[PDB]
Amino acid sequence: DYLYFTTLAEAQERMYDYLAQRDNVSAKELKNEATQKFYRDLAAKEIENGGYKITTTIDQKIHSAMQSAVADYGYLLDDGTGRVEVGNVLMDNQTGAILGFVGGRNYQENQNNHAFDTKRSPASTTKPLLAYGIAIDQGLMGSETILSNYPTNFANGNPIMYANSKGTGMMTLGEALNYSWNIPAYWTYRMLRENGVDVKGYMEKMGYEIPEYGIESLPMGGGIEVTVAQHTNGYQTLANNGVYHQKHVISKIEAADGRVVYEYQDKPVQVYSKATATIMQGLLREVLSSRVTTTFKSNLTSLNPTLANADWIGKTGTTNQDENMWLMLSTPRLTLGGWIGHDDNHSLSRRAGYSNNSNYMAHLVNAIQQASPSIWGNERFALDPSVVKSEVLKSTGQKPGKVSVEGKEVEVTGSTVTSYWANKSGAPATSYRFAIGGSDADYQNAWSSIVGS
């Protein structure tokens, strides 16, 4: 199966690294294609002959339970468009250890590994990581910050669409994420660009390879393609209070004569502040609980109510032509990534992610739990004490204050709310451009509504 080859390839990747140090301390010659093959062949020959013990991270009961789950419940993914393919990776949030995965529907009839090898746009699941998480991490927004969802166009003059909608008006970050509106995301990444935020640095620190960052639809998955295993690692990062642990299936390689030629060490990396990550956790909780973009929490409740009450957070994604659906799920302890789609890129049905993948993955979650009862955990996500609380106007997402609205000072007041920030001073006082994004025409409309106090 996938298991043998996934496991063997990373083990022989580790041997490669080991040897290029042992059998040579090799130069920048390591960028030579002939040295690359040579050490690959040597790494392969090493494992075949050296009588090595290769300890993987794979939990036997859980992985086997996952293989049974796709065998028994994979059919729930099929919607008339074919035998819908699938990839899932289950990851320990505190270590980056991969405990089990689904490579696809049936190895014998399709050998493509959809957990580890196949690469596809993360679509809207890019958003928490590339746009909102970074903007929060930079003190550029908090939990109740307002963004524009007013009609706007890409630089090439085509409208930013969401299904058949050209947009609406102002909305909170919560609303923007629960619905996965696109315009707010566009404006957020555009602000990071304009302010010279090293988004590349953040993404690369989590192991993401993206060839061109100068792309407007980047936060929506444009110009990105990723493996499920890698994309799961990004969500692990948010789940584990902002601390990245590199994904892996090999924990140790011992030679026949006892010695350790490779062993996992924990190298945590604080990619987002704990304030940021914890604030995002609370946003992603409501993404699932709101049920706007996924029936997951309902599906799971009907199967296992007690497990439905574990503290589930996550995000959905769907590519433009419904060719890819994603659902990423975390409890404090584990993250489970899910992708469905077709190898030839045919469109899925419009409810394929909303319903089918959601229902399928609720079944997968339950199978995992029957295989290892305590494993999802009863821990809850919680705000880090480093989080700054600002009482802000609901209408502006900023503190109450005076503003000039076409001449005339307005004392802006109304119903307030506690907004959570990841900077030092929290929310600013309200200014005329209170939201992320918006044209002068948008703001005339928005302030008119507000001024109807």
């Binding site: 063997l8 009588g51 939990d59 992985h63």
Partner: peptide
């Protein structure tokens, strides 16, 4: 013989 094991030492495959 080289062995690949689950986390609990149970052999997945011999090479």
């Amino acid at each position: 013989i080289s062995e690949i094991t689950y986390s609990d030492g149970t052999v997945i495959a011999s090479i």
